[PDB]
Design a protein around this nucleic acid. Structure first.
Ligand SMILES: [K+]
Ligand SMILES: [K+]
Ligand SMILES: [K+]
Ligand SMILES: [K+]
Ligand SMILES: [K+]
Ligand SMILES: [Mg+2]
Ligand SMILES: [Mg+2]
Ligand SMILES: [Mg+2]
Ligand SMILES: [Mg+2]
Ligand SMILES: [Mg+2]
Ligand SMILES: [Mg+2]
Ligand SMILES: [Mg+2]
Ligand SMILES: [Mg+2]
Ligand SMILES: [Mg+2]
Ligand SMILES: [Mg+2]
Ligand SMILES: [Mg+2]
Ligand SMILES: [Mg+2]
Ligand SMILES: [Mg+2]
Ligand SMILES: [Mg+2]
Ligand SMILES: [Mg+2]
Ligand SMILES: [Mg+2]
Ligand SMILES: [Mg+2]
Ligand SMILES: [Mg+2]
Ligand SMILES: [Mg+2]
Ligand SMILES: [Mg+2]
Ligand SMILES: [Mg+2]
Ligand SMILES: [Mg+2]
Ligand SMILES: [Mg+2]
Ligand SMILES: [Mg+2]
Ligand SMILES: [Mg+2]
Ligand SMILES: [Mg+2]
Ligand SMILES: [Mg+2]
Ligand SMILES: [Mg+2]
Ligand SMILES: [Mg+2]
Lengths: 394, 101, 238, 124, 336, 181, 46
RNA sequence: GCUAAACCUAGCCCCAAACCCACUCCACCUUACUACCAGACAACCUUAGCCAAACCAUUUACCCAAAUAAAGUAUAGGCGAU
RNA sequence: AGCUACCUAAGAACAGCUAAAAGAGCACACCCGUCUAUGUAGCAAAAUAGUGGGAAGAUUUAUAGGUAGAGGCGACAAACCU
RNA sequence: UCCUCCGCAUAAGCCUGCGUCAGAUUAAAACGAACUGACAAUUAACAGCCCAAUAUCUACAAUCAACCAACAAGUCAUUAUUACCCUCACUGUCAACCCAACACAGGCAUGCUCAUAAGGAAAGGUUAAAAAAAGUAAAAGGAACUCGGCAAAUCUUACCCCGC
């Protein structure tokens, strides 16, 4: 088979050893005593050198197999950069969860009452879009690495203005730079989710359970869809040096220990560096499951069992224009088997807040065809965003 | 010190010490208006602004707050009678600001 | 000169690799091949020509799913991203290969001949006589070196004494061991040879520089020559 | 058209050249990621300045000073003045052996000393 | 070619020079409170402030070593981000304006102006008049913009018996360096944004200007200078940019004052400032007979806490937190 | 303080400032190392002050008062260096026997010349030092002819110089014919 | 068109083409230095 | 009457004799004269041609270890030039 | 091979109008150099004025590197290689 | 009064090359000085100067990136474990400037200004011959000029040869 790496680019082989070395009982006269190369003396054989002390800028790590945390069994790690080939279907299998299309009626009813609507909601949201896409910087056309984080921050700020109507909204904070870890087994495969990036909306109170005990028991019939010949662990980081860490990201005693929403961004400027919609939704499911599992392992121990009190975690994933909404309920920690009570995930996909934005006027033959500003604004998208925020408070 | 070899430092080694320094400096009158707290020097080329701070504080007990330096080019334009260029030497200028008002 | 081949990568990947143009120069910096230069920048997608490469810890026949069929700037034929188990790789696409298809990479030679599906990789011994093949290897495990261009196909002519006789696109016969693996069907882009360049500029985009303006009198080499097909080329040692 | 005769300095050449060449100042640290310079305190020369209070020697010497003959110090003279007296005294006492040469001040090796004479590892 | 004025500066006594460039008189203390004709929960505000302090310092687990040189960006910067975010949410009932305010994170603020003239000393332009141009490129860690202007602290013609300091040498001796590039006047958003007025800015001093390092360089008396210089330059640029968004400039001086507030901190010590812009007529021509002066009020920096031992905040200072709340409670006067 | 960079304020404007003699090597050889260490800084501050005055004299386009003061301080400081160096050299010889503080070796360079190569300090051994191994400490045969030409150039110069002296000695006897003895 | 301006100075080019290191990189270049040394040139190389 | 004119030294040439050969500190093979980091490349291999032969094509003196002499002899050579 | 021929690495520039598809047209910047006059020890060892060809392309262009004379390079003009 | 062909800045190049004082040396003219001697000067935030190891990861252009349609198929991305407590050094910074033997009507990349807020002066004085150069206007005629409508003016018809 074709071998990669042409020989001319490979390290040259050591030069032929001087034949004086072959002769037994003969001591070669080399240039080592001279401390420099000469063509007419033999090449010295130098013994291996060891610095003998610690120099951090010239450190060399030990061989991989000799690391203390090296294990023969591989742990497949899903981190913020992992892009699943099969998208949600792969995530559904890994987390032993059943998918329901659309958000829960409990959540969506919160914004059906016009008393919960923000004052001048449509105008307020439109200004947020215009700020992020146009007025933000000194540059004519803000880039996605710029407006995507800001559009999410300002929308959360808009929702946070409702502390007046709902005093319970003062019991939550938006935390940055938090990370979490959870390990579990699926069909004898060791899996780990390491969550990082985005914003963690943290509450003092746990989110109400969504599904009744009757729906949780009705998931026993559901069969997880398989996708032979692709393995469930494709696109995961196969690691052989790891610790079985279960971490919520905070030390004991943190006033806001409960994860409420996980805001995940896909802000890369280049399209090939942005997750596809299905891949982003898969990341949301795994991150929501990871946060929920870390909470369950903390509160209810490391045992494998159907949870008497399900853990509910939400996630909002966006690239700045398209929004995805997830409500995840962790019903069980007995994940190694494919049969039994399954977790539940409510997913509302591909919710366009706006179709397009014109930063400059479109002038054809000295006539302004399109004005600057958002095109195709959908207020329903923000209504779902507000409903998820209001969940657990209003 | 100048025109001497500095002992090589490695992590965890002794402090480098100079006992008889051969750096000599001359305090000069500024050619342009300067702030009241600013003192101008012409120092050796190999002397750093860090050296001058410790040099002025250690030998003269002058409290220094800031030190800035620049390298002045000496003119190489003049010509001797053989039409050979004569180099006015380059020199380093330092600007020392006094500390406690 | 200081020429260093860009072909230094040692580990297989599906990430497009930055490649450097030669201009028809060799390592000495002198022109070795005329008519090469410029053209659009291109990235190299590493093609796996060994269709039967079981995963590290696996063995025997295995299946793969076609993820995408796409344009390849470095070759005439289209290429297909295939995934099986936890591995993804680029391969040469067949005429009717499309996303969502499943392909079978087997090394099994059975008493009976298999029903040949386009895009499947089988040993030549396992294929019915007359099957249209592509991406053939001269020796078992060497990897495909023949019938790789757009629309090209060979035909399995005979199977004798554990060997297979195939007709190459040039029509010259080729004897190989029956264990040499081939792919069923024609290569993608059957209408490649019908493309029209249209203008001199498009040849420049493809990295082709104009011909010399020097007039060369034609010699005895020129003129139609009717020669017999060369004798069958054999890679089997008896 | 270039000036071959003039000294090559950091003022000449493009931006990359001008920033790589210096004026002979000894380094006091290293550059880390982000071009962040890390100053090492031990690499900065520390001026050991003595207390000059009640010091009676002045920059110049009085002209009414008797001339003396110049006698440069030698290894022999230093040995006779510093080492020979102790060796002569122990010789009379009757307890002298090569093993005790370290007692008289001989240093078999320079390694392990803070100030090593050869290779010299200290500044003037 | 224009001077690059850095609000956060290593230059000694830069506050005095910045007063000259901006024609700003500095006053110790905060502005005189206006005598004119809901319950504040101090326990709740203190709790969240301590919760934000302990989160960054203790509770939040860091995957990577936090080195001393990274502490400002890794620890202090998230603190000030969250502290400003939670307080404005909690204080919306007391201050309705906050609910509709825009909260920016590290958004540029630019101001360009002309102050003074010089005679070109050298070259083919020697002997000709050249304006002294200045540019401030600031990045406040946080800031709050509102759609209605805050009330003036004092009258537009307010006079003080305090002369603005003068410089007897070139600005280059501060030191200050010249460069030529785009002249930007920017309040944090483009002119189309309705939130064109400034409420409060929150600044975090960089590691280069850390208290511990100033004491090591014999610059103990520059600790307060660094706060004052950053306040004067930042708020002059912000209020100046606000006035020019309303159409005012050197030849059309402001007809009403433009005020703003700043909170300057290094993560532990907090200093509070108020700035009133009374005049943009800073050119030689427009300042010839201009009695107006810009005013800046400032307090001495005070520690918000003493130490943080494990999960306990030692010596939390309620007065410093109260001062932060008072600025956030400022609101425009409602018209009849 | 900064006043030490200037002479006594009473001496400002005086045409001459009387000074003593420069320290001699023998006078300094009687002093302890600690005394010589203190004297170095006493001489250093005088040197800085005199260098300060010399520059200001040029700035004012006036003669420097008593310029010999600087020459005396430089001679004193050179004598102090020599005394301290002699003591260190004697100690190095006794304890090590090495005539030089800095290690070195006689080497042939790429040009065929014999040079004393002063060693430098390194953290890694020489056989691993990429830059060091690029240096050529040997000469190839093509250098041989150039060495001969250089030798012959030296011989020509020496021959002309010797012949000229003999010519001059004869011109001398012609002018003064009483030097036969 | 008009000639005479063939010299387009570049310190990088000058040093790389005619520098000390370049001269010493080949025996012919070393001999260049040896000839200039024998003639007594003040400037052995760029 | 201007412009000029005039000069005797500097040194140099050829032989003889004699073998020849440097050094303060610091810097210098990377872009020489650049304090301070992981390399490993390494030297040898017939001179040609002008020119003469009245072109040119084989051929055409070039210190090689004692001045002289043997001797421009033996001998070589388009048996020509040499 | 700091000019120039071709190439390699990674950069940069291209208004307005028409058509809106363009080795498309008009037309700046920019590249080129058709015709005439001037100039001819000139401003210039190839220029100036006007007039012209092209100007999103096989375009133009800054930077570093490569190919060397029994050779290179060449959309062959025996071009170009200070 | 009149020009604006520019201008300012960066890069590259150059290297003190119209700052002060003192000299009457001089600018293709001229006592201001780019020439001489002396004395001054450019101050880092801009820029240059960067990075511990091993394995592992990186299919999905750009074009307001959204519709739409493409080919010549494209400039920007990691994780795992180990190691790591420290701090602001060094260098460029002037000018009327470079490549063209010149204080040369030539050559010279990028940003901004799009006609200027920046930068500049076509006439040493006089006279008002010829010949010469660059322009403007011209009775009647309108290519009769000439190798040719070259040039100028105006601004258009049809055709042929060759080469797509
Ligand atoms: K293709
Ligand atoms: K002939
Ligand atoms: K080249
Ligand atoms: K210059
Ligand atoms: K010209
Ligand atoms: Mg500097
Ligand atoms: Mg190709
Ligand atoms: Mg052809
Ligand atoms: Mg042809
Ligand atoms: Mg020339
Ligand atoms: Mg060029
Ligand atoms: Mg002949
Ligand atoms: Mg002939
Ligand atoms: Mg070139
Ligand atoms: Mg290329
Ligand atoms: Mg265009
Ligand atoms: Mg075109
Ligand atoms: Mg055209
Ligand atoms: Mg060509
Ligand atoms: Mg021809
Ligand atoms: Mg011809
Ligand atoms: Mg910087
Ligand atoms: Mg400048
Ligand atoms: Mg050009
Ligand atoms: Mg002007
Ligand atoms: Mg004139
Ligand atoms: Mg004239
Ligand atoms: Mg005249
Ligand atoms: Mg007429
Ligand atoms: Mg006619
Ligand atoms: Mg007609
Ligand atoms: Mg006629
Ligand atoms: Mg015409
Ligand atoms: Mg044609």
């Amino acid at each position: 088979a074709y071998e990669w790496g042409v020989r001319s680019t490979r390290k040259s082989e050591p030069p032929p050893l001087d034949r004086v070395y072959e002769i037994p009982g003969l001591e070669p006269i080399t240039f080592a005593g001279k401390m420099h190369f000469v063509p007419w003396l033999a090449r010295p054989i130098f013994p291996p050198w060891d610095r003998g002390y610690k120099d951090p800028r010239f450190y060399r790590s030990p061989p991989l197999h000799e690391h203390p945390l090296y294990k023969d069994q591989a742990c497949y790690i899903f981190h913020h950069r992992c892009r699943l080939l099969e998208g949600v279907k792969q995530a559904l299998w890994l987390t032993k969860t059943k998918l329901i299309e659309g958000l829960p009626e409990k959540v969506l009813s919160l914004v059906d009452d016009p008393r919960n609507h923000i004052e001048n909601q449509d105008e307020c949201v439109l200004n947020v879009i215009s700020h992020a896409r146009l007025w933000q910087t000194t540059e004519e056309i803000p880039k996605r690495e710029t407006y995507c984080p800001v559009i999410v921050d300002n929308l959360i700020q808009l929702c946070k203005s409702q502390i007046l109507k709902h005093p319970s909204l003062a019991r939550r904070i938006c935390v940055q730079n938090s990370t979490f870890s959870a390990t579990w087994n699926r069909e004898s495969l060791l899996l780990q989710v390491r969550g990082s990036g985005g914003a963690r909306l943290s509450t003092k109170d746990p989110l109400p359970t969504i599904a009744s005990r009757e729906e949780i028991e009705a998931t026993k019939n559901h069969v997880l869809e398989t996708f032979y010949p692709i393995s469930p662990i494709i696109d995961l980081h196969e690691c052989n040096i790891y610790d079985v860490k279960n971490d919520t990201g905070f030390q004991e005693g943190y006033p806001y220990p409960y994860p409420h929403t996980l805001y995940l961004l896909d802000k890369a400027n280049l399209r090939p560096h942005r997750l596809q919609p299905d891949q982003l939704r898969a990341k949301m499911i795994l991150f929501a499951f990871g946060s929920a599992l870390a909470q369950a392992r903390l509160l209810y121990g490391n045992d494998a069992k159907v949870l008497e009190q399900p853990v509910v975690v939400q996630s909002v994933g966006t690239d700045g224009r398209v929004f995805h909404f997830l409500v995840f309920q962790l019903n069980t920690t007995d994940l190694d088997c494919n049969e039994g009570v399954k977790n539940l995930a409510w997913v509302d996909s591909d919710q366009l807040l706006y179709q397009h934005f014109w930063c400059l006027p479109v002038i054809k033959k000295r006539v302004v065809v399109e004005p600057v500003g958002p095109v195709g604004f959908k207020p329903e998208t923000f209504r779902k965003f507000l409903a998820l925020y209001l969940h657990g408070a209003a | 010190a100048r025109n001497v070899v500095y002992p090589l430092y490695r992590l965890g080694g002794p402090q480098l010490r100079v006992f008889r320094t051969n750096f000599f400096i001359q305090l000069v009158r500024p050619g342009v208006a300067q702030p009241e707290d600013t003192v101008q020097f012409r120092i050796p080329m190999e002397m750093t602004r860090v050296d001058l701070r410790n040099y002025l504080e250690g030998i003269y007990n002058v409290p220094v707050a800031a030190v800035r330096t620049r390298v002045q080019h000496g003119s190489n334009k003049r010509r001797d009678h053989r039409n050979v260029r004569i180099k006015k030497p380059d020199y380093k200028v330092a600007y020392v600001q006094l500390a406690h008002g | 000169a200081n020429f260093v081949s860009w072909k230094s990568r040692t580990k297989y990947t599906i990430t497009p690799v930055k490649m450097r143009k030669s201009g028809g120069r060799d390592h000495t910096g002198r022109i070795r091949v005329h008519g090469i230069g410029g053209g659009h920048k291109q990235r190299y997608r590493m093609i796996d020509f060994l269709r039967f490469r079981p995963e590290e810890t696996k063995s025997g026949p295995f299946e793969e799913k076609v993820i995408q069929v796409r344009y390849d700037p470095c070759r005439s034929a289209d290429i297909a991203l295939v995934a099986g188990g936890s591995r993804k790789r680029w391969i040469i696409a067949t005429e009717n290969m499309q996303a969502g298809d499943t392909i079978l990479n087997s090394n099994h030679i059975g008493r009976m001949a298999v029903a040949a599906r386009e895009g499947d990789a089988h040993p030549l011994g396992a294929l019915p006589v007359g099957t249209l093949i592509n991406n053939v290897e001269s020796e078992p495990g060497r990897g495909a070196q023949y019938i790789r261009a757009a629309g090209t196909c060979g035909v399995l002519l005979r199977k004798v004494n554990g060997t297979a006789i195939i007709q190459l696109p040039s029509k010259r016969q080729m004897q190989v061991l029956e264990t040499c693996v081939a792919t069923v069907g024609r290569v993608s882009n059957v209408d490649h040879n019908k493309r029209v360049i249209g203008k001199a500029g498009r040849n420049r985009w493809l990295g082709k520089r104009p011909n010399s303006g020097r007039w060369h009198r034609k010699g005895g080499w020129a003129g139609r020559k009717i020669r017999p097909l060369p004798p069958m080329k054999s890679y089997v040692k008896l | 058209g270039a000036d071959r005769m003039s000294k090559w300095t950091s003022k000449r050449g493009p931006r990359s050249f001008r920033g790589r060449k210096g004026r002979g100042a000894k380094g006091i640290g290293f550059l880390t990621s982000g071009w962040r310079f890390v100053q090492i305190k031990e690499m900065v020369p520390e001026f050991v300045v003595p207390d000059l209070t009640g010091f009676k020697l002045k920059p110049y010497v009085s002209y009414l000073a008797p001339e003396s003959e110049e006698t440069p110090l030698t290894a022999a003279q230093l040995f006779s003045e510093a080492v020979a007296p102790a060796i002569e005294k122990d010789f009379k006492d009757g307890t002298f052996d090569p093993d005790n040469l370290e007692k008289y001040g001989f240093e078999p090796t320079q390694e392990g000393k803070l100030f090593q004479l050869y290779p010299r590892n200290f500044l003037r | 070619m224009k001077y690059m004025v850095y609000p956060q500066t290593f230059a000694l006594n830069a506050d005095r020079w910045y007063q000259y460039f901006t024609k700003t008189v500095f006053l110790s203390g905060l502005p005189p409170p206006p005598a004119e004709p809901p319950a504040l929960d101090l326990a709740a505000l203190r709790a969240v402030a301590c919760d934000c302090l302990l989160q960054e310092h203790f509770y939040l687990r860091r995957r990577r070593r936090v080195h001393r040189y990274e502490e400002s960006e890794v620890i202090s910067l998230p603190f000030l981000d969250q502290l400003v975010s939670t307080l404005v949410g909690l204080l919306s009932p007391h201050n309705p304006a906050l609910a509709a305010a825009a909260l920016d994170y590290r958004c540029p603020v630019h101001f360009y102006w002309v102050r003074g003239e010089e005679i070109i000393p050298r070259g083919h332009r020697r002997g000709r008049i050249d304006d002294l141009r200045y540019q401030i490129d600031d990045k406040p860690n946080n800031q709050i913009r509102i759609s209605k202007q805050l009330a003036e602290f004092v009258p537009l013609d307010y006079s003080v018996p305090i002369e603005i300091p003068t410089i007897k040498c070139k600005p280059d001796k501060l030191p200050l360096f010249k460069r030529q590039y785009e002249n930007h006047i920017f309040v944090g958003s483009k002119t189309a944004d309705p939130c064109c007025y400034g409420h409060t800015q929150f600044h975090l001093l960089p590691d280069k200007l850390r208290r511990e390092r100033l004491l090591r360089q014999n610059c103990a008396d520059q600790i307060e200078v660094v706060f004052r210089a950053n306040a004067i330059a930042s708020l002059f640029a912000w209020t100046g940019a606000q006035a020019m968004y309303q159409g005012f400039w050197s030849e059309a001086d402001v007809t009403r004052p433009f005020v703003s507030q700043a909170v300057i901190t290094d993560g532990k010590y907090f200093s509070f400032f108020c700035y009133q812009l009374n005049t943009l007529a800073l050119t030689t021509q427009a300042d010839q007979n201009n009695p107006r002066k810009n005013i800046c009020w400032g307090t001495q920096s005070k520690p918000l806490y003493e130490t943080i031992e494990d999960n306990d905040v030692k010596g939390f200072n309620d007065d410093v937190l109260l001062q932060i709340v008072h600025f956030l409670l400022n609101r425009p006067k409602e018209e009849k | 303080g900064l006043e030490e960079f200037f002479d006594d304020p009473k001496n400002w404007g005086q045409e001459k400032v009387k000074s003593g003699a420069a320290w001699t090597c023998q006078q300094l050889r009687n002093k302890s190392n600690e005394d010589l260490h203190k004297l170095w800084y006493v001489l250093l501050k005088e040197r800085n002050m005199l260098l300060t005055l010399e520059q200001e004299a040029k700035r004012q386009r006036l003669p420097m008062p008593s310029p010999e003061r600087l020459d005396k301080v430089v001679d004193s400081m050179d004598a102090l260096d020599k005394v301290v160096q002699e003591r260190e050299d004697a100690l190095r010889l006794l304890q090590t026997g090495q005539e030089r503080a800095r290690p070195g070796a006689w080497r042939r360079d790429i040009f065929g010349r014999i040079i004393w190569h002063k060693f430098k300090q390194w953290v890694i051994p020489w056989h691993l030092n990429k830059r060091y191994n690029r240096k050529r400490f040997f000469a190839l045969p093509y250098v041989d002819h150039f060495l001969r030409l250089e030798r012959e150039k030296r011989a020509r110069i020496k021959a002309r110089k010797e012949n000229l002296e003999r010519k001059k000695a004869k011109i001398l006897l012609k002018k003064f014919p009483h030097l036969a003895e | 068109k008009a000639r005479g301006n063939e010299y387009q100075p570049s310190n990088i080019k000058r040093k790389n083409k005619h520098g000390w290191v370049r001269r010493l990189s080949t025996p012919a270049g070393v001999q260049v230095i040896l000839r200039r040394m024998l003639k007594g040139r003040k400037s052995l190389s760029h």
